Design goal:
CATH superfamily of the largest domain in chain A: HIV Type 1 Reverse Transcriptase, subunit A, domain 1
CATH architecture of the largest domain in chain B: Roll
CATH topology of the largest domain in chain B: HIV Type 1 Reverse Transcriptase, Chain A, domain 1
Helix content of chain B: 25-40%
Strand content of chain A: 15-25%
Number of strands of chain A: 15
CATH class of the largest domain in chain A: Alpha Beta
Radius of gyration of chain B: 34 Å
Radius of gyration of chain A: 26 Å
Structural class of chain B: alpha+beta
CATH class of the largest domain in chain B: Alpha Beta
Number of domains of chain B: 5
Distance between the termini of chain B: 87 Å
Largest sheet of chain B: 6 strands, mixed
Order of helices and strands of chain A: HEEEHEEEHEEHEHHEHEEEHEHEH
Oligomer: heterodimer
CATH topology of the largest domain in chain A: HIV Type 1 Reverse Transcriptase, Chain A, domain 1
Shape of chain B: elongated
Distance between the termini of chain A: 57 Å
Protein name (chain A): p51 RT
Strand order of the largest sheet of chain A: 13-12-11-14-15
Bound molecules: ligand EFZ
CATH architecture of the largest domain in chain A: Roll
Strand content of chain B: 15-25%
Chain lengths: 398, 551
């Protein structure tokens, strides 16, 4: 019946975040769910004397008929005291992720901090007052949960870390990441093995993530248009690679010619291009990760289902860049695709640096807030802001 | 009064509420409060204090409406700002459209409920207030239960009500009880007598917990008035909307009118306010009198006719689909009606022209849909199926090529003009034979003096001076010229990322005159291909205009 006292960042107060509207279906599922946790002592209904509140909703993470309660403690976490990364995790063949949230129900929360964990189950058309609860145990999604549980966590983990001191197990929030250079059969079985050990209590490829190369258009014949677009893309890239030169190409344009006129390249321009392709055959030197600084994930809509992104801390010094596609069935849903993208990039940022990136989403606030919850499937929620993607920024990574 | 567990209250950390002095009143008021108080004291409401209490609120005596008898009020105004914050009672209020049809409906006015609920004994002290007396010769009191005008009274009462009902609701799941203020709206699909009998059970149940409610003969009967509507148990109608006809129309009158007409535009079709609104231009005072114009005197008249029309509606049937159909009622203006059965509307509404920097129909339509979707999740916890005046091909073309994440729930095209379209589309490749304008524009960061022009293949050109302009204004100006001094197919190369992006987004409405003009020119052309090149480079054509727009 022990309880480590947890407090809010000095002078801070509990979160009073409003509950967005939920669908009948998500409400029903949540009433079932909460009634259960209430019976088991996990939570308890609260009174009006508690003025704090946190948003909650329901999801279905990868192939599930049954719903999962999800609480957005982002604001509570940003207000919770601080507490206290094996680069080996990133440098693995495969890395599997595990949801250990359940573990937390086992631990009771410092009763004085409970008031802050207050959340509400809305009623359709406001016909009824919302149902108010607060946690009695450690809530999943709370930055303090993993911490206060570390102690017990490590314990239950030693056995597997001693039996297999070749695998890396990193925990982030409610997730546990395990990476090993084994082969799949033995790897997935060794995993199933870990979930066996975990149960008697309560598929990514890292060597594949990098800074993708900027490729330049090659064609039989070049028009004035073609050269301009070419020079534009290059001129931008000069920002990342000062060596990049466009003198020769610009010359080919001297004069106010038609846009479609076919321009014959010179031996000089061809060298100029030859030379730039080479400057671009690799990422710009001297780009290192700074832990004392925020990670930033920028995404641009390429269209047709494609989305390029760059993770970075300082402008033009990409720590990583990429593209995301397909996801059959989402063939007509920009929000699904974007949400999947953000998750894919978060997990990735977690693996690599063990922290989430602040997102810059090319979407209108309203659009994203209406539906993103309908396609979320993680236990965590990164931070984000909305933007108006530059016409350029796109043709460049395109 | 009630025997329900009090709620634990505390004063905002640190703060404490003892002070604000007694407002000496006449001898008629001092004794007209000495009386009323002696009353409450007995009922167990207030408790003559003094024992140990430094806190104090001022009592007043106001002429009770229609009474030669006096009534009291207590300024907790101070006490409240020192009182902890509570969980908001929820200000999102039920809308007729979300109600389910019922056979019988009753409304139980719990009214005198604040004084029926126990206050946190532990906190009572903080309520103290006094009654003055000639020659300060000595009356000190403090509440024992929720006080009329205290911060937590509503919140704490509402919560007590929820608890007290909890059992009854588990017992009678076929009965619907809606809380709101001191009111209880109970509806059911039972037979009239069966229903009347459950109410009595409810009333006595509430009375067991000390909450007195009205008799079946003191009850108020349907329809009930709800934020503008008349609520019947099987349907709803709109309270008549009477427009006054006067010879004197101060500014105020004109506004309130517009105000009511706006509220009416949601429910009624074809309401207009354009000319009543014109009447407020340059007004100098609220009391000012403005003569209604001819067209003003007219729409007002045509609006009265419309307001006579009786508008009825239907409630929600969970077993049927939700369908929302939208209409473009002008640029940026949309109309919508949500229904389940053709012509039997649950709700209707209007979204006014959102006037921003630059959009277009498809985008505008998209926001409309997002709006109706959120409204619906709220009202019904469901998203309607949409019937939109746009082709899957246009939507297909728009999104497939738009730079932002955009989406629209299950929807169906409905051919009901005026339709939403893309008024023009930029070429994806240069145009052969079409002329080629290399535009540019510039301005000083100190004088705001700018030049904007172009140079083209075919020798044609033209520069022009601007005053009080910016880089972005001149750059856009440049493109306008080109669209003017050009044929029906044009290739334009600009160095303005600004200009580019605004246009790339193919807008059909803006609040900038210039932008609007260009939009027009754009709609006109047969083929337009817009291109961008980096600003100050030796890039043929662009270096040329960079020369002319530099003095
Ligand atoms: O769900 C329904 N159906 C309904 C139908 C007709 C009427 Cl007049 C009233 C209702 C009701 C309510 C309410 C207050 C919000 C107004 C009731 F609770 F049943 F009373 O909510």
């Amino acid at each position: 019946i022990e309880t480590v006292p947890v407090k809010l960042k000095p002078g801070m107060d509990g979160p009073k975040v409003k509950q967005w509207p939920l669908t009948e279906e998500k409400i029903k599922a949540l009433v079932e769910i909460c009634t259960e946790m209430e019976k088991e002592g996990k939570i308890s209904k609260i009174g009006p004397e508690n003025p704090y509140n946190t948003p909650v909703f329901a999801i279905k993470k990868k192939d599930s008929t049954k719903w999962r309660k999800l609480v957005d403690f982002r604001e509570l976490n940003k207000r919770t005291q601080d507490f206290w990364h094996p680069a080996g995790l990133k440098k693995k063949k495969s890395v599997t992720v595990l949801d250990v949230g359940d573990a937390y129900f086992s631990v009771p929360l410092d009763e004085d901090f409970r008031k802050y964990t207050a959340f509400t189950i809305p009623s359709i058309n406001n016909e009824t007052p919302g149902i108010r609860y607060q946690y009695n145990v450690l809530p999943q999604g709370w930055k303090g949960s993993p911490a206060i549980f570390q102690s017990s966590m490590t314990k239950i983990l030693e056995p597997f870390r001693k039996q297999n001191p070749d695998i890396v197990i990193c925990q982030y929030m409610d997730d546990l990441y395990v990476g090993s250079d084994l082969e799949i059969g033995q790897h997935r079985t060794k995993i199933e093995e870990l979930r066996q050990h975990l149960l008697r209590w309560g598929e990514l490829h890292p060597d594949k993530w990098t800074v993708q190369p900027i490729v330049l258009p090659e064609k039989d014949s070049w028009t004035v248009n073609d050269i301009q677009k070419l020079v534009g893309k290059l001129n931008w890239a000069s920002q990342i690679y000062p060596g990049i030169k466009v003198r020769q190409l610009c010359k080919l344009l001297r004069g106010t010619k038609a846009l479609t006129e076919v321009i014959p390249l010179t031996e000089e321009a061809e060298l100029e291009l030859a030379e730039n392709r080479e400057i671009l055959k690799e990422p710009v030197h001297g780009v290192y990760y700074d832990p004392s600084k925020d990670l930033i994930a920028e995404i641009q809509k390429q269209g047709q289902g494609q989305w390029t992104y760059q993770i970075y801390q300082e402008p033009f010094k990409n720590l990583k860049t990429g593209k995301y596609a397909r996801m059959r069935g989402a063939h007509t849903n920009d929000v699904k695709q974007l949400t999947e993208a953000v998750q894919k990039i978060t997990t990735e940022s977690i693996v690599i640096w063990g922290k989430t990136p602040k997102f810059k989403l090319p979407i209108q606030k309203e659009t994203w807030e209406t539906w993103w919850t309908e396609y979320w499937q993680a236990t965590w929620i990164p931070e984000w802001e909305f933007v108006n993607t530059p016409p350029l920024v796109k043709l460049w990574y395109q | 009064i009630s025997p329900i567990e009090t709620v634990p209250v505390k004063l905002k950390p640190g703060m404490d509420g003892p002070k604000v002095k007694q407002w000496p009143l006449t001898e008629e008021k001092i004794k007209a409060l000495v009386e009323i108080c002696t009353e409450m004291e007995k009922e167990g409401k207030i408790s003559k204090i003094g024992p140990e209490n430094p806190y104090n609120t001022p009592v007043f005596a106001i002429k009770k409406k229609d009474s030669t008898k006096w009534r009291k009020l207590v300024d907790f105004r101070e006490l409240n700002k020192r009182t902890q914050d509570f969980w908001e009672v929820q200000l999102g209020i039920p809308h007729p459209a979300g109600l389910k049809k019922k056979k019988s409906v009753t409304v139980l006015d719990v009214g005198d409920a604040y004084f029926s609920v126990p206050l946190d004994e532990d906190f009572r002290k903080y309520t103290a207030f006094t009654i003055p007396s000639i020659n300060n010769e000595t009356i000190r009191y403090q509440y024992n239960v929720l006080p009329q005008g205290w911060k937590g009274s509503p919140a704490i009462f509402q919560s007590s009500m929820t608890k007290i009902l909890e059992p009854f609701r588990k017992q009678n799941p076929d009965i619907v009880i809606c809380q709101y203020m001191d009111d209880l709206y109970v509806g059911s699909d039972l037979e009239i007598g069966q229903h009347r009998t459950k109410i009595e059970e409810l009333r006595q149940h509430l009375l067991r917990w000390g909450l007195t409610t009205p008799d079946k003969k003191h009850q108020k009967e349907p329809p009930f008035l709800w934020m503008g509507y008349e609520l019947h148990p099987d349907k709803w109608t709109v309270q008549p909307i009477v427009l006054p006809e006067k010879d004197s129309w101060t500014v105020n009158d004109i506004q309130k009118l517009v105000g009511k007409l706006n509220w009416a535009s949601q429910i009624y079709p074809g309401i207009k306010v354009r000319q009543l609104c014109k009447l407020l231009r340059g007004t100098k005072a609220l009391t000012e009198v403005i003569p209604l114009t001819e067209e003003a005197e007219l729409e007002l008249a045509e609006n009265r006719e419309i307001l006579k029309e009786p508008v009825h509606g239907v409630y929600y049937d969970p077993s049927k689909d939700l369908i929302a159909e939208i209409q473009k009622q002008g640029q940026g203006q949309w109309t919508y009606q949500i229904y389940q059965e053709p012509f039997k509307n649950l709700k209707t509404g209007k979204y006014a022209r959102m006037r921003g920097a630059h959009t277009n129909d498809v985008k505008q339509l998209t926001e409309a849909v997002q709006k109706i979707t959120t409204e619906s999740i709220v009202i019904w916890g469901k998203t309607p199926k949409f019937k939109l005046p746009i082709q899957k091909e246009t939507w297909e073309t728009w999104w497939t090529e738009y730079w932002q994440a955009t989406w629209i729930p299950e929807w169906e095209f409905v051919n009901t003009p005026p339709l939403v379209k893309l008024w023009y589309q930029l070429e994806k490749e240069p145009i052969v034979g079409a002329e080629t304008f290399y535009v540019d524009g510039a301005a000083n960061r100190e004088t705001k003096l700018g030049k904007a022009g172009y140079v083209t293949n075919r020798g044609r050109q033209k520069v022009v001076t601007l005053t009080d302009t910016t880089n972005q204004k001149t750059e856009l100006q440049a493109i306008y010229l080109a669209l003017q001094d050009s044929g029906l197919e044009v290739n334009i190369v600009t160095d303005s990322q600004y200009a580019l992006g605004i246009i790339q987004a193919q807008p059909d409405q803006s609040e900038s005159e210039l932008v609007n003009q260009i939009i027009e020119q754009l709609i006109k052309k047969e083929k337009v291909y817009l291109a961008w090149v980096p600003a100050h480079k030796g890039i043929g054509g662009n270096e040329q205009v960079d020369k002319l727009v530099s003095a």
